[PDB]
Design a protein around this ligand. Structure first.
Ligand SMILES: CN1C(=O)NS(=O)(=O)c2ccccc21
Ligand SMILES: [Zn+2]
Length: 257
């Protein structure tokens, strides 16, 4: 099945998932000089004060911190969005080396990692219905660079030992995702897709311009995770990123001058 290896990685995905060669695939390179300021874009509204985290899962591709999305508790609104989008999970993509790991790039620059906060449009009732709609999801993407530690990430880092291998999960309550946000909410936005199979074209991407800084020790602990299950040969969970895909007939809009 699909993964990030030589024989099942991104260049192979189109055989099982032909939408991989579609018209609104993600990620993309953000050419900062070609992105156009759109003064009609509103400020983002990130309302995470009542977020209820539940669990952290190694799914064999990344680790997901999952939230209770049975009520409007942590929501994203405003910006390019119409309506209300509920936080369901976040996860990261990262590299084997600090010079790679992000999915989106900025003027071809690759960051060490990228955080995806995944939200679904409440007008579709559930996540599974939302992913079938062109405006079903809103993903807030945040770049990670290596420098000073991010204090609000440490609780995530310290539980990873307990979910080393595929299929392991651990209770992960009371985690505040506000501790993962940079100061500025300036962003770029474009219509795109999930970045792993099934690669559905259901995402409004909102990518923040300001990266967060994490320490080398923090990202090193991401790289100790495993793609494999327990009792299988160890394959380090690294380079779980899809490279930039053709922009095709899309414009990237900027919220800022
Ligand atoms: C699995 N996966 C990703 O890797 N990156 S993402 O496009 O933000 C995403 C969004 C929704 C569901 C799954 C997702
Ligand atoms: Zn992702």
């Amino acid at each position: 099945h699909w993964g990030y290896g030589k024989h099942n990685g991104p260049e192979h995905w189109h055989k099982d998932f032909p939408i991989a060669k579609g018209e609104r695939q993600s990620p993309v390179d953000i050419d900062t000089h070609t992105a156009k300021y759109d003064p009609s874009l509103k400020p983002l509204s990130v309302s995470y004060d009542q977020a209820t985290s539940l669990r952290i899962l190694n799914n064999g591709h990344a680790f997901n911190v999952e939230f209770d999305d049975s009520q409007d508790k942590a929501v994203l609104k405003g910006g390019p969005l119409d309506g209300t989008y509920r936080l369901i999970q976040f996860h990261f993509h990262w590299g084997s080396l600090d010079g790679q790991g992000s999915e989106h790039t900025v003027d071809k620059k690759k960051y060490a990692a990228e955080l995806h906060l995944v939200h679904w449009n409440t007008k579709y009732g559930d996540f599974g219905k939302a992913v079938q709609q062109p405006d079903g999801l809103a993903v807030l993407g945040i770049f990670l660079k290596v420098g000073s530690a991010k204090p609000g990430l440490q609780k995530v880092v310290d539980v990873l030992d307990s979910i080393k291998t595929k299929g392991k999960s651990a209770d992960f309550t009371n985690f505040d995702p506000r501790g993962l946000l940079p100061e500025s909410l300036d962003y770029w936005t474009y219509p795109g897709s999930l970045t792993t199979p099934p690669l559905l074209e259901c995402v409004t991407w909102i990518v923040l311009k300001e990266p967060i800084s994490v320490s080398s020790e923090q990202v090193l602990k991401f790289r100790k995770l495993n793609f494999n299950g327990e009792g299988e040969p160890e394959e380090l969970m690294v380079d779980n990123w899809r490279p930039a895909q053709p922009l095709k007939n899309r414009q990237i809009k900027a919220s800022f001058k």
